[PDB]
Scaffold this active site. Sequence first.
Site, PDB file in Angstrom:
ATOM      1  CG  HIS A  48      -1.878   1.183   1.244  1.00  0.00           C
ATOM      2  ND1 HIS A  48      -2.887   1.299   2.176  1.00  0.00           N
ATOM      3  CD2 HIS A  48      -1.916   2.320   0.509  1.00  0.00           C
ATOM      4  CE1 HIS A  48      -3.527   2.442   1.993  1.00  0.00           C
ATOM      5  NE2 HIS A  48      -2.957   3.081   0.989  1.00  0.00           N
ATOM      6  CD  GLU A  78      -4.570  -2.958   1.061  1.00  0.00           C
ATOM      7  OE1 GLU A  78      -4.384  -1.969   1.813  1.00  0.00           O
ATOM      8  OE2 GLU A  78      -4.952  -4.071   1.491  1.00  0.00           O
ATOM      9  CG  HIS A 200      -6.538  -4.364   6.854  1.00  0.00           C
ATOM     10  ND1 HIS A 200      -6.826  -4.295   5.506  1.00  0.00           N
ATOM     11  CD2 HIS A 200      -5.560  -3.453   7.073  1.00  0.00           C
ATOM     12  CE1 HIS A 200      -6.062  -3.379   4.940  1.00  0.00           C
ATOM     13  NE2 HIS A 200      -5.284  -2.855   5.867  1.00  0.00           N
TER      14      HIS A 200
END
Lengths: 246, 249
Positions: A48, A78, A200
């Site tokens: 990310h 991401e 997550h």
Amino acid sequence: HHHHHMTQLSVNVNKIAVLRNSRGGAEPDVVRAAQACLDAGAHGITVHPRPDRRHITAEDVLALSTLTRARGVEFNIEGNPFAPPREGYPGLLPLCAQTRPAQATLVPDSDHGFDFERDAERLRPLVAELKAMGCRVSLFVDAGNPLLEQAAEVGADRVELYTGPYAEAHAAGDAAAMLELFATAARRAQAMGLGVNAGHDLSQDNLRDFLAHVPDVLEVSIGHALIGEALYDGLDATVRGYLALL
Amino acid sequence: HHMTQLSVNVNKIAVLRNSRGGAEPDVVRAAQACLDAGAHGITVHPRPDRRHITAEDVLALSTLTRARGVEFNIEGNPFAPPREGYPGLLPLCAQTRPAQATLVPDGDGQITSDHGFDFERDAERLRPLVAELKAMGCRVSLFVDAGNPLLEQAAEVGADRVELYTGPYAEAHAAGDAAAMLELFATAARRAQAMGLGVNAGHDLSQDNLRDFLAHVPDVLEVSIGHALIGEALYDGLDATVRGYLALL
């Protein structure tokens, strides 16, 4: 309609870059750590790249693209599709334009999903542009979202259920209410032709109950807890431990 | 005449924890696994900006090292006033009574420690703080550069040891030719020992350069190793990594 498929593991290596950046040299090496995760049998790598370059950089993305490409595995980027480019940050879509990853996971800023009443129309042309590059498009959503099905209206291929509140409930002991909710959310998405990813706060201590109750989860992106467990047992063992749970 | 001892710096464990903002990985559990593997003590450096280790971590690791009969080493800037979430080094040491206190000049916002004390400017403000630490029972170590021309003044200030900053040695070792650095650090060690100072070392020490350092720098009493030990543990785990370091002493 589809058929069952074995859940795949993507290792998120953000925290490896976090350790690198804290000192500011070259160790630990992000590519080397990802390589050891793919050697242990992981199906892909997730990163990310934030606009502020707090951990993963644009240079890391290109380097990991070359890695995942040479090994025939999946790369998952991401990021916030709305963030315009700034110095040191080319933007999510141009990054995907340059690397053509298998998946692009779109986040609104990670602790919540998209407000489809507010963001669907500036999301639409960007989802379409990402797919036109060859990217699967996944949208970070909350399991309690009443407008969750609208991600299909935007053209997304998958949703990624934000599993934060499940892991918090799992550590406290009573996660049944969360599991029925996340199972129901998964079922609603699949009724619209959407694939379901998750991650997550997923760990070796809570993944099993999750996959046993949430059906046909296609991919899990696990970072934080996998890195923290690897401090004790190593990256090779940790990944193989996750794989044995899929 | 003394076995070099290994102090594990667990800052980078808090680096992984704080980035998330929960409780994992647990700093105390990780230090516990390091001590189970035979590490001789725990080191932390609570920075004023709370980037990783906090005062609560210090209190918790103090309780741990005390229950296991090992030494607690707190690095820090004695001059740093208390901030939000940070009581200051000297009140922390008064509250926890660590065996050793390692003093660094580090200003606010330094990525890491990259220089030792300038005794021309800091010796007189060091003196009463050194003395107050010793009055708490702390052995006092001063971060110094191996090339410091006033290195001997650390004895005058009242410190018990110096810690040679090994950064430039590790950089020379990675480049292949570390002989010149080894003689300099050996000379610095002998200069300190001629004043009755014990010699610690650390920063950028790794499994790839510790052996040659101890082989040439004499009577090194303690090494504080953090960043590279945590990074090597990502591949092999803490227990295996710690035991690897012990075999290199």
